[PDB]
Symmetry: T
């Protein structure tokens, strides 16, 4: 499946629904909607499309990964807190044999608490982008573009 043939799946994990609605001062101002638009743009430039979703539920993300698996040209995923706990998410991505996956984190997890330093997703992800702000999602889109074609 190519970029032209199918969309890029963009998945966002728990609490990301509240992006840019917390402390517009300490946290950014961009919202999940601003982020999605960043993706549409980025994908468009390469003649591609995206399919942008967010969920707080472990199992629902598993379901979307299976859908991606059969119907999408790659996955850009920010597992958010499930990055550090979900073997389930990791196993679902392991079934996507041959599919480009890029993992993205808005903040530099490596500067945070020690329990965030490890990500189950990072053993399957082809690339991992961390602490590049919302710009990481564009980087994620571009990397899929390159890999997918």
């Amino acid at each position: 499946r190519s970029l032209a043939n199918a969309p890029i799946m963009i998945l966002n994990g728990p609490n990301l629904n509240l992006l840019g609605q917390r402390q517009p001062e300490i946290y950014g101002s961009d919202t999940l909607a601003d982020v999605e638009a960043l993706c549409v743009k980025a994908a468009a430039a390469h003649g591609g499309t995206v399919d942008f979703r967010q969920s707080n539920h472990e199992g629902e993300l598993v379901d979307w990964i299976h859908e991606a698996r059969l119907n999408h040209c790659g996955i850009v995923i920010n597992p958010a807190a499930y990055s550090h706990t979900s073997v389930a998410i990791l196993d679902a991505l392991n079934t996507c044999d041959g599919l480009p996956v890029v993992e993205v984190h808005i903040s530099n997890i490596h500067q945070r608490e020690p329990f965030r330093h490890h990500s189950y997703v990072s053993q399957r992800a082809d690339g991992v982008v961390a602490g590049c702000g919302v710009q990481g999602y564009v980087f994620g889109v571009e990397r899929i573009a390159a890999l997918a074609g």
Copy 2:
């Protein structure tokens, strides 16, 4: 948001629906309905109300936290098993800037298995009560009362 303005959210994690229905001998005789009533009563003494919920799903508890964040004056939470596994509930509670939070554990988790000794929730909670029985929910209510007022 005050105790008179809005209710206190009392969230209950997995398996607590079966409270008191196991071995009325080794475990208590009190039910989730008994706990709810202990909470309604303790809050009425301070002129407030509660909104009492239980779920076995992590993401649903996350959703309820986001709810509380905009609509309630505090959170009493017994995360049960998710206490030890849920970075997602911790992140959820972290979006509740300025909102009092008290963690309650019926049993004394420090006397149980080592995996029970750590809670992700305790690093955000203002207070943690453990091993005081269902009475610890009344404590949790009293504390929310003092912080909110």
Copy 3:
């Protein structure tokens, strides 16, 4: 409750819906439906029945465990990835006093990554069967048969 009174609950964790639809070469060719057929046949030989289910959601697995506790004669469970992460599913199983429970892994988890070597379910499970293929579910049913009678 006997094998003649109530069915055996067989529960399957995340990702098992894709069983046998991956790399029919590296991975087997039996589907979840094949497995369910195998369990019905083994139960029938003992004059019993099975109730066969699968879910990607941790909370839904817990609910099904609560049900079994009141309506089934035993549990055969492949927690998949949740074996390694879910304290919740263990505490659910822990309410099943006196009920037989056998944990089954299709692959030998002890030959894979160190994080799969530990299962929370194995401390409640009466028996644990790993790396015996889909045949391990038949062994599960026979064990339940023997414990239930």
Copy 4:
């Protein structure tokens, strides 16, 4: 020994003599004297009395626990630093067969340095209250009132 029969021992560890005399801004303003009053008041509501003490010496706290054993209806203890270091006081409490014991920490030790995360006293404490401020000693007295009657 009942609440109407004998006093509640309230024991306070090292450095607590300086409670509220440090930085009235970052630390509270309540003193060990204000806490005793809170304690006396809570216990009078249930028709009981308190015996309130404080010492910097491990051995002296061990001496006071042996006394409680013969003269008191229960123990509310804030071991302070000795929580993390004193097997001696754990062992002293262990000789108090069937005596209600509640452990209190004014601050939420779970948010402090890792060495403060474990307490030897918690494995004997019937309950543990941390992070509830000086109000925690109130909860302590209440819990003892419920256990002792």
Copy 5:
């Protein structure tokens, strides 16, 4: 080699010679002889035979594994204590290229002491059966019968 061509080697580690004879007198408990009789019948159901042995000596077990490598159709092994200490027994099993191996533990080693949670045999064994009682041996014979044919 087929079951028709050669027996299944059933190896029993140290202390198993005392199976079922610990005091006082629990009626109807199985002895090592009982297990041998169960094994003979299980293999006969599939047209096969068994060569059932037991040893207290690490080195003899190794010798018997070398024997099986050339004369037997598969191995069922209850290494007992040696499961946790014998790299030598694993290294012997590793010389048995292609040969089927199933490790059997009568008790659920995962509910006992932490040192018994790891088995060296388990990294070679094709399948591991724990805490299915003496019935686990019959599961071990059935698995060999399926891998052999």
Copy 6:
């Protein structure tokens, strides 16, 4: 201070002089020359220039870090093996107060050996990009442009 004022330092650690001259089959085909060219172009798009350097010496990398501190508008660094051992390069970066740093790894270090899972530089870098191939350098550059402007 800015992209138009001063160049971007791009620093390459040890063994990167051999980029693309190894097994043009298992490893890429692009050379450091190519990468440098990728960087020049990305920079030019934003009207900036790069100052691309490589070295096998820990101290030389420190020296170079101090130079960027006074004469460059940001740093992109791939410290290669020194990511996991070099506290001195971390401390050098730490002197570069307010200067944007981005760490690039060609390969996904989280999929490799455990000793490569930690990087000292990661606790100073604003962002970290791993496993996106040479393309990550370009990301590094694009991010420096954004932080710089």
Copy 7:
């Protein structure tokens, strides 16, 4: 200093004054007064005397060690909880160059909680006796007699 010259110092750490006054059923019936009398008799058999003491205070124990060092022919110590926490007692014992020291525990600490498995006193003690009951204190005396002569 010989056995005929000076007494054997017998020292007893915290909580041991309560020996035999707990659960005459689960714990022994023997009191510290019974122990002292066994020590006197043993030491007499060898023409020696004893100086038997108990304290709940770390520092007083260090004081008596310093006394023994100059006035006694040996030390039998049961340090109780201080075995596991007291570097100070170990340092005190360290200044007693050439002096025979025997450590005694009534119960088999190796069968208890993991934190009682380690003893600071044991790297200095010539002999360690554990789980031999109060008779162990007689073993202690006899070893001193043999070491002093």
Copy 8:
């Protein structure tokens, strides 16, 4: 079986056949024949006898424990190296229900390499004596005497 009924088995582990034959200067001068004579003497005094044995084989020590289990009044054991590696001898000792057992080490193993600090035998042994020299075996005989009567 009493002391007047049956002998005390005294088992000796590997390499002890060379006791006192090494560096009569840095190691003692007593031999295994001298230790045997001490034990016969100590036992006779209480009207008992001993069966004194040494082997370098793990398996033979397990055989002998099985023999003691039925024919002897208790076990004094110095497992030497096998103290630190043998689950099999621990498990043998575990079958000897109600049989008194004392562990003896000549040297104080707690002053040697960390790997000698843990003994598998210590979790079953009623008493452990260490670094009391050959006299420890006399201590062991005396402990059995008191335990058998």
Copy 9:
């Protein structure tokens, strides 16, 4: 408080009263009195005085720390064994807001046993001087004079 206003408190932990009285060969010849003289002279060179004390009691060292906090210009402390165990002395020193504190060890603790490598005092002390012999006390006083003025 200035050096001209109040004395420097010089506190010495357990076993230091025996300084120089041990092996005048392996250990020095300087006594605690000699050390006190050295401290008077160092303070005097800066116009100041010292208040020199030693105790084998944890809780007394705390009392004296509380005393210094209100009556002295600084602390020089050789905690001895309590450096490795005393969270209480650490907490006492933490109440000394803005008071200069220096920690002194006569021997280089980093060359001794691993339990001696960590000091609780060092996380509060402004400086730590180790292995500089009794001269280290002089350095201590000189540092307090510099920080005090």
Copy 10:
């Protein structure tokens, strides 16, 4: 003992009987017989002899080490699996005062499973050769020749 006075003992641990008989492709083709011949030739060149043995039994290797201590000029040992498990072999080599000992491993243990990275034998062995194939035994004999000469 020189090389002219006594043979060099070459000892081979468990499973080495099967040397060269497994997968002549993945494993070598050399057998234990080929190795002995390499060893006889190397010893002759230096005017000595060898005494070449192989056993699967820990305690026999122990017996043979005792023998060598009296009868041989040195020991060249390939402990195979017992390298990682036998404190008993180590204790045997330790009684061999003044005797040269070289440890040999055909494969480079440092590149296999982590439990293979440690050898109890390496802490007594004068030298350790690994990963140099059967040629490593030649080095072994050469090193003994240089030490015994």
Copy 11:
């Protein structure tokens, strides 16, 4: 050999060249030139001289240590980052038999990140001075002066 014969070598590891040029507010104002001046002064007072150097290169530091070994009377060293990572610098100091060495840290490393708590140099250094500011360099020169004379 002596302070009069030869200079004191003073070495400074990486990034120390920037000393006092960072944030004159959070960090001191003294430069490496100011430190060299304090050292000269302090040595002159004892009729000695100093040879003050700084390097970012591990290997150059080793070369200077070799030099001092034959041409200097002692070493005062602030290894900076290399303290925590340089086995090579430790090994070079270890060649300097009988030569006095004092390690000095400007900040109290014990209060920073856990990877800074350990120094390879402290196992060789006779004394270690930390968190005494640039004054720690003066203490070092004094210690050297006392040790050299």
Copy 12:
């Protein structure tokens, strides 16, 4: 490349320049010039040559490793302290596809401090020789001869 075609590179890490110049009594008398001779000598017997180099600088060893990769027929390397610390020397060796590498340590590193137990270079080296003295470099030259031809 062959032994006839190209030299064997023999690389020596830090501090080995002082080999035989320390304590001729505790350390050998052999110098790096003597080791070099033993290398030339061993290579000549097989018709080959050597290129013998020593450096204190990590990055210089890495440069030399690149050099060997294109011009030499193998590497024998004694990385000295960098064995334990240098991931960059490891990575250099990994670029040398198909080239025989042997690590040599003069001393038996397994008998010294724990930090010396692990070598990064051992995971790439074909063979590792330790504690065989300077003779080890001879074994290393021969192994290179055997693998190169």
